[PDB]
PDB file of all heavy atoms in Angstrom:
ATOM      1  N   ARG A 105     -10.083  14.540 -13.704  1.00  0.00           N
ATOM      2  CA  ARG A 105      -9.011  14.854 -12.657  1.00  0.00           C
ATOM      3  C   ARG A 105      -9.569  15.386 -11.311  1.00  0.00           C
ATOM      4  O   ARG A 105      -9.069  14.905 -10.250  1.00  0.00           O
ATOM      5  CB  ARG A 105      -8.018  15.846 -13.145  1.00  0.00           C
ATOM      6  CG  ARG A 105      -6.619  15.888 -12.344  1.00  0.00           C
ATOM      7  CD  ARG A 105      -5.843  17.104 -12.449  1.00  0.00           C
ATOM      8  NE  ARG A 105      -5.058  17.197 -11.211  1.00  0.00           N
ATOM      9  CZ  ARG A 105      -3.966  16.621 -10.960  1.00  0.00           C
ATOM     10  NH1 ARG A 105      -3.379  15.763 -11.927  1.00  0.00           N
ATOM     11  NH2 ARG A 105      -3.390  16.678  -9.730  1.00  0.00           N
ATOM     12  N   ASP A 106     -10.452  16.258 -11.413  1.00  0.00           N
ATOM     13  CA  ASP A 106     -11.127  16.985 -10.261  1.00  0.00           C
ATOM     14  C   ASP A 106     -11.828  15.895  -9.445  1.00  0.00           C
ATOM     15  O   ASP A 106     -11.672  15.908  -8.145  1.00  0.00           O
ATOM     16  CB  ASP A 106     -11.994  18.111 -10.664  1.00  0.00           C
ATOM     17  CG  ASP A 106     -11.244  19.324 -11.158  1.00  0.00           C
ATOM     18  OD1 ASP A 106     -10.084  19.613 -10.578  1.00  0.00           O
ATOM     19  OD2 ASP A 106     -11.862  20.042 -12.015  1.00  0.00           O
ATOM     20  N   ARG A 107     -12.602  15.011  -9.954  1.00  0.00           N
ATOM     21  CA  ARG A 107     -13.337  13.840  -9.261  1.00  0.00           C
ATOM     22  C   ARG A 107     -12.251  13.066  -8.506  1.00  0.00           C
ATOM     23  O   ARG A 107     -12.412  12.796  -7.406  1.00  0.00           O
ATOM     24  CB  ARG A 107     -14.146  13.049 -10.161  1.00  0.00           C
ATOM     25  CG  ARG A 107     -15.272  13.717 -10.851  1.00  0.00           C
ATOM     26  CD  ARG A 107     -16.024  12.772 -11.762  1.00  0.00           C
ATOM     27  NE  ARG A 107     -17.228  13.411 -12.356  1.00  0.00           N
ATOM     28  CZ  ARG A 107     -18.506  13.167 -11.856  1.00  0.00           C
ATOM     29  NH1 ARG A 107     -18.702  12.483 -10.767  1.00  0.00           N
ATOM     30  NH2 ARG A 107     -19.502  13.817 -12.477  1.00  0.00           N
ATOM     31  N   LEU A 108     -11.161  12.668  -9.230  1.00  0.00           N
ATOM     32  CA  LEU A 108     -10.131  11.849  -8.670  1.00  0.00           C
ATOM     33  C   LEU A 108      -9.477  12.673  -7.486  1.00  0.00           C
ATOM     34  O   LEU A 108      -9.223  12.069  -6.449  1.00  0.00           O
ATOM     35  CB  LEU A 108      -9.032  11.466  -9.693  1.00  0.00           C
ATOM     36  CG  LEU A 108      -7.832  10.685  -9.326  1.00  0.00           C
ATOM     37  CD1 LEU A 108      -8.237   9.351  -8.538  1.00  0.00           C
ATOM     38  CD2 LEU A 108      -6.869  10.401 -10.369  1.00  0.00           C
ATOM     39  N   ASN A 109      -9.056  13.907  -7.702  1.00  0.00           N
ATOM     40  CA  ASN A 109      -8.421  14.609  -6.604  1.00  0.00           C
ATOM     41  C   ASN A 109      -9.412  14.771  -5.395  1.00  0.00           C
ATOM     42  O   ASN A 109      -8.806  14.628  -4.327  1.00  0.00           O
ATOM     43  CB  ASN A 109      -7.802  15.870  -7.133  1.00  0.00           C
ATOM     44  CG  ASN A 109      -6.918  16.590  -6.068  1.00  0.00           C
ATOM     45  OD1 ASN A 109      -7.261  17.643  -5.471  1.00  0.00           O
ATOM     46  ND2 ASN A 109      -5.760  15.980  -5.660  1.00  0.00           N
ATOM     47  N   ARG A 110     -10.709  15.007  -5.565  1.00  0.00           N
ATOM     48  CA  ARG A 110     -11.641  15.141  -4.364  1.00  0.00           C
ATOM     49  C   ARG A 110     -11.681  13.802  -3.577  1.00  0.00           C
ATOM     50  O   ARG A 110     -11.537  13.792  -2.445  1.00  0.00           O
ATOM     51  CB  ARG A 110     -13.102  15.282  -4.973  1.00  0.00           C
ATOM     52  CG  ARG A 110     -14.170  15.099  -3.827  1.00  0.00           C
ATOM     53  CD  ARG A 110     -15.605  14.782  -4.520  1.00  0.00           C
ATOM     54  NE  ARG A 110     -15.979  13.375  -4.355  1.00  0.00           N
ATOM     55  CZ  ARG A 110     -16.207  12.612  -5.328  1.00  0.00           C
ATOM     56  NH1 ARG A 110     -16.136  13.088  -6.610  1.00  0.00           N
ATOM     57  NH2 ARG A 110     -16.569  11.299  -5.213  1.00  0.00           N
ATOM     58  N   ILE A 111     -11.628  12.634  -4.328  1.00  0.00           N
ATOM     59  CA  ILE A 111     -11.715  11.282  -3.617  1.00  0.00           C
ATOM     60  C   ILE A 111     -10.399  11.105  -2.841  1.00  0.00           C
ATOM     61  O   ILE A 111     -10.423  10.673  -1.701  1.00  0.00           O
ATOM     62  CB  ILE A 111     -11.783  10.177  -4.735  1.00  0.00           C
ATOM     63  CG1 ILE A 111     -13.333  10.252  -5.257  1.00  0.00           C
ATOM     64  CG2 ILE A 111     -11.578   8.816  -4.196  1.00  0.00           C
ATOM     65  CD1 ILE A 111     -13.475   9.551  -6.605  1.00  0.00           C
ATOM     66  N   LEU A 112      -9.166  11.519  -3.540  1.00  0.00           N
ATOM     67  CA  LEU A 112      -7.888  11.326  -2.858  1.00  0.00           C
ATOM     68  C   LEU A 112      -7.806  12.284  -1.596  1.00  0.00           C
ATOM     69  O   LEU A 112      -7.387  11.846  -0.599  1.00  0.00           O
ATOM     70  CB  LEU A 112      -6.789  11.649  -3.828  1.00  0.00           C
ATOM     71  CG  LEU A 112      -6.528  10.568  -4.879  1.00  0.00           C
ATOM     72  CD1 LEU A 112      -5.526  10.997  -5.981  1.00  0.00           C
ATOM     73  CD2 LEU A 112      -5.861   9.302  -4.185  1.00  0.00           C
ATOM     74  N   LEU A 113      -8.296  13.505  -1.763  1.00  0.00           N
ATOM     75  CA  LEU A 113      -8.260  14.426  -0.692  1.00  0.00           C
ATOM     76  C   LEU A 113      -9.037  13.865   0.462  1.00  0.00           C
ATOM     77  O   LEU A 113      -8.487  13.958   1.618  1.00  0.00           O
ATOM     78  CB  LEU A 113      -8.757  15.880  -1.085  1.00  0.00           C
ATOM     79  CG  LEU A 113      -7.937  16.601  -2.069  1.00  0.00           C
ATOM     80  CD1 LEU A 113      -8.719  17.817  -2.622  1.00  0.00           C
ATOM     81  CD2 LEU A 113      -6.501  17.019  -1.431  1.00  0.00           C
ATOM     82  N   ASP A 114     -10.205  13.505   0.305  1.00  0.00           N
ATOM     83  CA  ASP A 114     -11.168  12.887   1.312  1.00  0.00           C
ATOM     84  C   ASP A 114     -10.402  11.636   1.921  1.00  0.00           C
ATOM     85  O   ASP A 114     -10.438  11.613   3.198  1.00  0.00           O
ATOM     86  CB  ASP A 114     -12.460  12.476   0.743  1.00  0.00           C
ATOM     87  CG  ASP A 114     -13.468  13.580   0.454  1.00  0.00           C
ATOM     88  OD1 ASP A 114     -13.176  14.756   0.915  1.00  0.00           O
ATOM     89  OD2 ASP A 114     -14.515  13.349  -0.161  1.00  0.00           O
ATOM     90  N   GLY A 115      -9.854  10.826   1.141  1.00  0.00           N
ATOM     91  CA  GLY A 115      -9.056   9.691   1.536  1.00  0.00           C
ATOM     92  C   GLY A 115      -7.943   9.987   2.462  1.00  0.00           C
ATOM     93  O   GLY A 115      -7.691   9.351   3.547  1.00  0.00           O
ATOM     94  N   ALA A 116      -7.099  10.962   2.196  1.00  0.00           N
ATOM     95  CA  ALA A 116      -6.014  11.424   3.015  1.00  0.00           C
ATOM     96  C   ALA A 116      -6.456  11.940   4.352  1.00  0.00           C
ATOM     97  O   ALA A 116      -5.889  11.584   5.396  1.00  0.00           O
ATOM     98  CB  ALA A 116      -5.160  12.435   2.374  1.00  0.00           C
ATOM     99  N   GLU A 117      -7.533  12.699   4.289  1.00  0.00           N
ATOM    100  CA  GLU A 117      -8.100  13.304   5.519  1.00  0.00           C
ATOM    101  C   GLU A 117      -8.754  12.210   6.415  1.00  0.00           C
ATOM    102  O   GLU A 117      -8.613  12.227   7.674  1.00  0.00           O
ATOM    103  CB  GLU A 117      -9.096  14.393   5.266  1.00  0.00           C
ATOM    104  CG  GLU A 117      -8.372  15.738   4.766  1.00  0.00           C
ATOM    105  CD  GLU A 117      -9.345  16.821   4.529  1.00  0.00           C
ATOM    106  OE1 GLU A 117     -10.566  16.544   4.285  1.00  0.00           O
ATOM    107  OE2 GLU A 117      -8.739  17.906   4.440  1.00  0.00           O
ATOM    108  N   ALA A 118      -9.439  11.283   5.816  1.00  0.00           N
ATOM    109  CA  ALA A 118      -9.975  10.137   6.535  1.00  0.00           C
ATOM    110  C   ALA A 118      -9.025   9.309   7.214  1.00  0.00           C
ATOM    111  O   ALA A 118      -9.334   8.776   8.356  1.00  0.00           O
ATOM    112  CB  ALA A 118     -10.897   9.248   5.598  1.00  0.00           C
ATOM    113  N   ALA A 119      -7.794   9.169   6.693  1.00  0.00           N
ATOM    114  CA  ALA A 119      -6.741   8.407   7.332  1.00  0.00           C
ATOM    115  C   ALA A 119      -5.979   9.239   8.413  1.00  0.00           C
ATOM    116  O   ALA A 119      -5.116   8.690   9.138  1.00  0.00           O
ATOM    117  CB  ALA A 119      -5.771   8.030   6.183  1.00  0.00           C
ATOM    118  N   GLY A 120      -6.309  10.568   8.488  1.00  0.00           N
ATOM    119  CA  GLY A 120      -5.681  11.468   9.518  1.00  0.00           C
ATOM    120  C   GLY A 120      -4.616  12.467   9.001  1.00  0.00           C
ATOM    121  O   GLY A 120      -4.222  13.206   9.954  1.00  0.00           O
ATOM    122  N   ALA A 121      -4.494  12.618   7.752  1.00  0.00           N
ATOM    123  CA  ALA A 121      -3.566  13.641   7.270  1.00  0.00           C
ATOM    124  C   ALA A 121      -4.265  14.997   7.438  1.00  0.00           C
ATOM    125  O   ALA A 121      -5.339  15.215   7.316  1.00  0.00           O
ATOM    126  CB  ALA A 121      -3.222  13.495   5.798  1.00  0.00           C
ATOM    127  N   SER A 122      -3.446  16.073   7.654  1.00  0.00           N
ATOM    128  CA  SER A 122      -3.842  17.450   7.727  1.00  0.00           C
ATOM    129  C   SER A 122      -3.444  18.131   6.430  1.00  0.00           C
ATOM    130  O   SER A 122      -2.364  18.122   6.097  1.00  0.00           O
ATOM    131  CB  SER A 122      -3.320  18.277   8.869  1.00  0.00           C
ATOM    132  OG  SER A 122      -3.724  17.524  10.200  1.00  0.00           O
ATOM    133  N   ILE A 123      -4.482  18.598   5.706  1.00  0.00           N
ATOM    134  CA  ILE A 123      -4.110  19.302   4.388  1.00  0.00           C
ATOM    135  C   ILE A 123      -4.384  20.833   4.539  1.00  0.00           C
ATOM    136  O   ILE A 123      -5.439  21.256   4.985  1.00  0.00           O
ATOM    137  CB  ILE A 123      -5.016  18.753   3.225  1.00  0.00           C
ATOM    138  CG1 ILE A 123      -5.098  17.196   3.391  1.00  0.00           C
ATOM    139  CG2 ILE A 123      -4.366  19.172   1.909  1.00  0.00           C
ATOM    140  CD1 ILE A 123      -5.938  16.520   2.163  1.00  0.00           C
ATOM    141  N   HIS A 124      -3.325  21.541   4.084  1.00  0.00           N
ATOM    142  CA  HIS A 124      -3.331  23.093   4.128  1.00  0.00           C
ATOM    143  C   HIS A 124      -3.250  23.621   2.763  1.00  0.00           C
ATOM    144  O   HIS A 124      -2.315  23.434   2.091  1.00  0.00           O
ATOM    145  CB  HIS A 124      -2.089  23.465   5.107  1.00  0.00           C
ATOM    146  CG  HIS A 124      -1.925  22.711   6.380  1.00  0.00           C
ATOM    147  ND1 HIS A 124      -2.781  22.875   7.430  1.00  0.00           N
ATOM    148  CD2 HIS A 124      -1.124  21.651   6.610  1.00  0.00           C
ATOM    149  CE1 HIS A 124      -2.389  22.032   8.349  1.00  0.00           C
ATOM    150  NE2 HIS A 124      -1.350  21.240   7.891  1.00  0.00           N
ATOM    151  N   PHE A 125      -4.364  24.221   2.389  1.00  0.00           N
ATOM    152  CA  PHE A 125      -4.333  24.725   0.942  1.00  0.00           C
ATOM    153  C   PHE A 125      -3.961  26.190   0.844  1.00  0.00           C
ATOM    154  O   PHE A 125      -3.725  26.804   1.893  1.00  0.00           O
ATOM    155  CB  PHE A 125      -5.850  24.562   0.434  1.00  0.00           C
ATOM    156  CG  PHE A 125      -6.250  23.182   0.407  1.00  0.00           C
ATOM    157  CD1 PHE A 125      -6.909  22.461   1.387  1.00  0.00           C
ATOM    158  CD2 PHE A 125      -6.159  22.400  -0.739  1.00  0.00           C
ATOM    159  CE1 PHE A 125      -7.353  21.194   1.349  1.00  0.00           C
ATOM    160  CE2 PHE A 125      -6.527  21.084  -0.924  1.00  0.00           C
ATOM    161  CZ  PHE A 125      -7.214  20.453   0.170  1.00  0.00           C
ATOM    162  N   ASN A 126      -3.874  26.754  -0.277  1.00  0.00           N
ATOM    163  CA  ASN A 126      -3.440  28.208  -0.592  1.00  0.00           C
ATOM    164  C   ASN A 126      -2.112  28.486   0.015  1.00  0.00           C
ATOM    165  O   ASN A 126      -1.948  29.719   0.425  1.00  0.00           O
ATOM    166  CB  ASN A 126      -4.634  29.135  -0.042  1.00  0.00           C
ATOM    167  CG  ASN A 126      -5.978  28.738  -0.493  1.00  0.00           C
ATOM    168  OD1 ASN A 126      -6.204  28.799  -1.758  1.00  0.00           O
ATOM    169  ND2 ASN A 126      -6.790  28.159   0.249  1.00  0.00           N
ATOM    170  N   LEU A 127      -1.205  27.584   0.023  1.00  0.00           N
ATOM    171  CA  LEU A 127       0.108  27.697   0.589  1.00  0.00           C
ATOM    172  C   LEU A 127       1.162  27.064  -0.365  1.00  0.00           C
ATOM    173  O   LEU A 127       1.199  25.837  -0.540  1.00  0.00           O
ATOM    174  CB  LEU A 127       0.286  27.157   2.000  1.00  0.00           C
ATOM    175  CG  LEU A 127      -0.380  27.928   3.150  1.00  0.00           C
ATOM    176  CD1 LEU A 127      -0.276  27.113   4.455  1.00  0.00           C
ATOM    177  CD2 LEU A 127       0.337  29.346   3.252  1.00  0.00           C
TER     178      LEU A 127
END
Side-chain angles (χ1 to χ4, degrees):
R105 195 202 156 84
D106 287 328
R107 291 180 177 263
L108 175 57
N109 188 250
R110 169 199 104 241
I111 291 164
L112 284 170
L113 294 169
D114 283 349
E117 288 181 340
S122 301
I123 319 179
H124 313 286
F125 297 88
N126 308 293
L127 285 171

